[PDB]
Structures are given as structure tokens and as C-alpha cells.
RNA sequence: GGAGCCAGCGAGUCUAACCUUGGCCGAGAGGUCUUGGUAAUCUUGUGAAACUCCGUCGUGCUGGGGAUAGAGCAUUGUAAUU
């Protein structure tokens, strides 16, 4: 099985937010300390009823918020991230816990020289 | 009496050097770990490492590879805080270059942008 | 070849015959013609000079001036 | 009569080191050997188990010729440039955990009191044992 | 690595939060409780570095040199991912 930091997946998702923050590098902890802005939330009330009503994926929610946090409650939604030009579309697998969200869209095109 | 060579670690290692600086041609093996490894050994630090008895060279090996059992305090190791299980390690050897070329190719997994330009410059 | 940096029975029989014949002696002298390492050598003159075979005339840690007497 | 003053530095030291590791009194931290003394630094103290004595001795003798002093100066004092690698050099205070456990341990046998004005003093005591060491040590000549 | 130990030209808050001594905690970066100064007055003798003395190293890309890279701990900011 998956397991992040010495916790187990099945106990993951029962999780709630402020006890994860506790296994969390010191980037993460000084972020919710600092106090985490209201912008998340917005998202998160439509990225849940996106899988509440799901017919079996949730199909694409899209943000701007290339600045937030990749948190438990929201493994196996599918997000569009916007690049500042186009929308890049990912599925939140576990391995990902942790990171930020613009790390999965690239903002500018390999220099080639061709 | 006298070794000119001695092999430990799967390393060479030679008697001629200074042993709190020969130590170092290991992996992983900086001058300071060297440093405080041999003091917890007590063995004398001014000997040249072909001086060294067997049963001196086993406690040392014996404490590279478990250092949190003789209280060294952890934010001395170069693993602290390990991602699958929150354990604190030392890495040597050969295991060296096998937990890196293993973070990566997981970055790589994962579709991470360090992962993408890592591999696109290779 | 390499300097040695373990002092075995031959060169210290040596060393207690040749180093009286040398008009001047320091570090370097004994790291040149004899062949032990230099860490040996600031072994070798803090022993002869308490054994008295060489008289010290300055001493200054970066240099070194002893003489037959 | 003599004072400190009439003693050379690199000397008065030596042999208070000396006398004071004897008596055993001086309370050690206990972390020494893996403490650098300062984020300037690279490698820890050369002299393993003399070290501290040695600063226990400076620090004495420093603050019996001055009017009083504190934790904060001994750290500029101590202080030294650092690397910094490929940029150019830099002055950096030393390690202020050391320096504040070597001030509690001296005044626990009395050399040392605290101040009005903040800082620590030398003690009436502190002066008769410094003296002491000074003429021994011209003595010894 | 340990010990010795010396400058000159600046700049600083009530509009409010600038320059910060001293005590305590911490390996460190840093934290915390108080304090002086609208300044030849307090920070500040700005106890700066090279430098001097005593030791270790011994001519070997070496204990010279520290780019590139991994893991972790803090600080500024609404926000540190490239």
C-alpha cells in the first residue's frame, strides 16, 4: 500500500486537514500557521459537490489558485490548472500529497534551437 | 603488524592516512560524521588507520550504520524525516545514488516539473 | 615511492648515527635526505633535543634551526 | 605586590587552564565534542577535552580588566569571518550558548557576581584567586 | 584549531515602532522579557578583517578549491512552485 509518512492511505482520508498539517515539512506548517486566505474554500465548497454528484469521475473542475496546497480531502478529483495562457487537466493521486498545484503546469515551451 | 589496505563498506581504505580522514573515501562519510563516529568509539584519533585492530574497526562500522542508538542527536543525519516512514537514517555506500536516482525517477512518476526538466535534459 | 610515516627499527638505528654529522638540521632537512614524513620529523627534533644530541639556537613553530652541537 | 597586568597573556592562561581543570569543580556542559563554537567555523575544537577549561580561563582574566561585560559582547569578541564560498568574506558572531554556560559556571564557585547595570563583575574573591595564580606563575621564571 | 587584540567616515522611533544594551531558551539560524536614545550624551571603545603567538597537516587535484545535487529546520511577505 501507499503511505505517507509512516500513515497508512486507510487512514488517510478519514484525516481532517489540521491533523495532516502536524507530518508536514516546515513550508506547509509556517502556510496554515500564517493563516491560509478564504480563497481555498470557495474552491473547495464547488470541488465537493463536483464528486458528491458524480455519476461514477467527477469531470474537470478549473482554477487559477496555481498557489495552493495539494490536501487529502481532495484526492481523486479532476482539476484544469490554468498556465496563464491554456488549462492543463490532472487527477489527484495520492503520491502528490504535499505538493503545490502549479507544479503540474508548465508555464513556458523547451528551447530547442532546432 | 602493519596493513597497507584494509577493505570495509565494500571500500578500499588505506593504513597510511590519518584514520578520522581515511574514513571519508566512504560515501556519505563527511570529515564532521567521521569526526564524532570516532570519538563515541573512542579510539585515539591521532593513530594512522593501519594501527587499527579488527575488533577496533568493527564498533566503528558498528555505529556508522546505527547512530541514533548512541545518541547522536539525529539533526546530525543526513535523512531525517524519511517521506515513506518518518524514521530518521544515515545513507552509505552503494546505498548512496540508490535512494537518489530513486526521488527523482518518483518526481518523474508523478509528472512534477523537477521530475520533466531532469529527465528532458537528459 | 613515499615518504614513511611509521618509524621502523631500521631508520630509528639510522637516525640516532646520521643526524650528529649534519651541520644544520630542521624539517626539511630530515624530510630530504632521510625519507620519513614531515609529520615524523617534528617527532623526531622534540625527542632529540630532550635526548641532547642537538642544541637549539630559535624556535618559531613555522621554522626550526638546530645545530650539531 | 603583583596584578594580572604583570603577567603575559598567552601564559597567565596556560596555567590557570591548568589549575582549574585539577580542582574539578567547573561544571561542563555535557554536548561538548560536537559543538563547533561558532557558524564561522568548520571542524569542532582541535583539543578535545581541554577546550572549555581554556575559554573558562580567557573569559576570567577578560572580564577582571574591564568594568563589566555581557553575553552579547563575548560573541563579537569570539567572532571571526566566514567563507561564504564563492562570495567574499564576512564577519560572524560566535556561538552565544556556549559563551552563556561558561559565565553560569564561573559564578557558581564565585569568581563572578552579577552587576547593577546589567553584565557580570569580578568578584572580591574572583581578585584574590587571579592573584594568586599571577604570582605563581612569575615565580615559576 | 586555540589564544592575543587595534579604527575612521555614517545612520537611527511618538506620524509612532527605527537603531538596540542586559537577563533567559536553542547546535545553529533564531526566539522571548525588559531598557537607553529625536542623539559629541544611547546602540558604540561600532572589542572590524588582514595581522601576531602556540599546535595539527607534509607535497599527494591533498586536510587546496566548493560548482552541481539530496534531505531537514527557520525568517520576510497577501503569496516563496520555475
Known sequence: THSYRGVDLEKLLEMSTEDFVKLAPARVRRRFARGMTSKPAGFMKKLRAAKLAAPEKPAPVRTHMRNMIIVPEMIGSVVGIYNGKAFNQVEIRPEMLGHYLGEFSITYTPVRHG | ?122 | ?69 | ?141
Not at chain 2, 542527536?73 to 548512496?96: C, E, M, S
Open chain 3, 1 to 69: 615511492a613515499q615518504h614513511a610515516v611509521i618509524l621502523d627499527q631500521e631508520k630509528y638505528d639510522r637516525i640516532l648515527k646520521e643526524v650528529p654529522t649534519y651541520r644544520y638540521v630542521s624539517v626539511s632537512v630530515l624530510v630530504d635526505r632521510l625519507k620519513i614524513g614531515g609529520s615524523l620529523a617534528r617527532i623526531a627534533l622534540r625527542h632529540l633535543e630532550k635526548e641532547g644530541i642537538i642544541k637549539p639556537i630559535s624556535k618559531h613553530s613555522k621554522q626550526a634551526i638546530y645545530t650539531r652541537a
Open chain 2, 1 to 122: 603488524s602493519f596493513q597497507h589496505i584494509l577493505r570495509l563498506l565494500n571500500t578500499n581504505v588505506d593504513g597510511n592516512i590519518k584514520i578520522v580522514y581515511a574514513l571519508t573515501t566512504i560515501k556519505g562519510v563527511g570529515r564532521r560524521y567521521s569526526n564524532l563516529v570516532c570519538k563515541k568509539a573512542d579510539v585515539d584519533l591521532h593513530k594512522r588507520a593501519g594501527e587499527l585492530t579488527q575488533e577496533e574497526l568493527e564498533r566503528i562500522v558498528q555505529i556508522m550504520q546505527n547512530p541514533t542508538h548512541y545518541k547522536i542527536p539525529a539533526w546530525f543525519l543526513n535523512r531525517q524525516n524519511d517521506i515513506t516512514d518518518g524514521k530518521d537514517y544515515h545513507t552509505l555506500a552503494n546505498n548512496v545514488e540508490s535512494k537518489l536516482r530513486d526521488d527523482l525517477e518518483r518526481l518523474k512518476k508523478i509528472r512534477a516539473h523537477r521530475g520533466i526538466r531532469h529527465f528532458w535534459g537528459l
Open chain 4, 1 to 141: 605586590g603583583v596584578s594580572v597586568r604583570d603577567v603575559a597573556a598567552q601564559d597567565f592562561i596556560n596555567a590557570y587552564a591548568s589549575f582549574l581543570q585539577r580542582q574539578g569543580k567547573l561544571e561542563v556542559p555535557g554536548y561538548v565534542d560536537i559543538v563547533k563554537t561558532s557558524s564561522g567555523n568548520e571542524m569542532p575544537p582541535q583539543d578535545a577535552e581541554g577546550w572549555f577549561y581554556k575559554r573558562a580561563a580567557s573569559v576570567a582574566r577578560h572580564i577582571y580588566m574591564r568594568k563589566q561585560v555581557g553575553v552579547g559582547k563575548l560573541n563579537k569578541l569570539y567572532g571571526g569571518a566566514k567563507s561564504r564560498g564563492v562570495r567574499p568574506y564576512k564577519h560572524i558572531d560566535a556561538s552565544g550558548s556556549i559563551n552563556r554556560k561558561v559565565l553560569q559556571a564561573l559564578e557558581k564557585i564565585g569568581i563572578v557576581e552579577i552587576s547593577p547595570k546589567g553584565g557580570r563583575r569580578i568578584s572580591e574573591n574572583g581578585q584574590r584567586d587571579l592573584d594568586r595564580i599571577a604570582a605563581q606563575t612569575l615565580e615559576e621564571d
